[PDB]
Amino acid sequence: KKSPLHFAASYGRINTCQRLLQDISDTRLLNEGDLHGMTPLHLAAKNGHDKVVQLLLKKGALFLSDHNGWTALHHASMGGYTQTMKVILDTNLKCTDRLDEDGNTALHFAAREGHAKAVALLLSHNADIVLNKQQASFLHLALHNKRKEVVLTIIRSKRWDECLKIFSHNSPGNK
Amino acid sequence: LIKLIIQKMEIISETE
Numbered sequence: 001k002k003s004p005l006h007f008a009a010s011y012g013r014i015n016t017c018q019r020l021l022q023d024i025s026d027t028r029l030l031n032e033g034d035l036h037g038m039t040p041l042h043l044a045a046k047n048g049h050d051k052v053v054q055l056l057l058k059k060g061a062l063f064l065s066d067h068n069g070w071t072a073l074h075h076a077s078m079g080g081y082t083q084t085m086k087v088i089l090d091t092n093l094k095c096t097d098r099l100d101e102d103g104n105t106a107l108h109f110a111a112r113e114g115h116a117k118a119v120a121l122l123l124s125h126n127a128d129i130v131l132n133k134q135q136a137s138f139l140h141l142a143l144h145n146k147r148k149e150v151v152l153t154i155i156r157s158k159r160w161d162e163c164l165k166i167f168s169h170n171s172p173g174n175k
Numbered sequence: 176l177i178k179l180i181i182q183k184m185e186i187i188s189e190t191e
Contacts, residue, residue: 004191012182047178 002032009040009056012049021059030061037067045072045088048081057091069100077106077122080115089125097128104132111138111154114147123157135168 001020008016017040021030031039041061044052053072063071073095076084088095097105107127110118119138131137142150154163167174 007190012178 002029005029005040006034006043009049009052010043010047012044012047012052014049014051014055017052017055021055024059027060030056030059031064037065039064039072041072042066042070042075045081045084046075046079048076048079048084050081050083050087053084054087057087063092063095066100069102071095071098071100071106073098073106074100074104074109077110077115077118078113080110080113080118082117082121085118085121089121093125096122096125097130099130102133103130105130105138107138108132108136108141111142111147111150112145114142114145114150116149116153119150120153120157123154123159127159129159129163129166131166131168134173135171136174137163137166139163140167140174 005017005020007013008020031041033039034043038046039061041053041056041063044056065071066074070078073085073088076088099105105128107119107122107129110122119142129137132141139151139154142154154160157163
């Protein structure tokens with residue numbers, strides 16, 4: 001019954017997820033894995049269904065990690081969905097500054113894919129700006145992809161001076 | 176609109 005829950009959470013079927021999650025006894029089916037190691041929390045956050053991920057948090061789910069170290073907030077910021085992002089941020093705050101296997105945070109992905117409101121949402125909260133495995137900040141990773149709107153909304157922010165301070169003198173790429 | 180179609184679609188005899 002794991003594959004119907006993965007299909008119903010991967011496409012925003014809220015009533016099918018309510019009918020599958022009536023038995024509140026066994027939570028081993030709720031936090032189960034995938035072939036690529038994704039919980040239904042990860043699938044519901046990847047496609048950007050806020051009510052499904054709110055239901056899975058209300059029933060009780062654990063912020064596990066992908067095989068590549070991603071989180072639900074990493075998928076929601078890779079997609080640029082502000083609603084699931086806002087729900088995950090309103091539940092907990094200890095999941096924001098979280099690293100993947102490559103050292104990227106969620107703000108790195110939200111700036112790499114060029115989502116302005118996602119960057120503004122993680123930036124209005126405390127984002128804990130850190131470098132990459134290749135010593136790249138999120139501002140570097142936005143400038144190399146020529147994303148005009150996200151670097152403009154970094155400039156319009158209040159954290160801009162702080163965003164200017166951090167880089168690597170030794171790194172030949174992010175000069 | 177297409178994602179809304181899949182969200183509201185009725186699936187019988189194609190599940191699991």
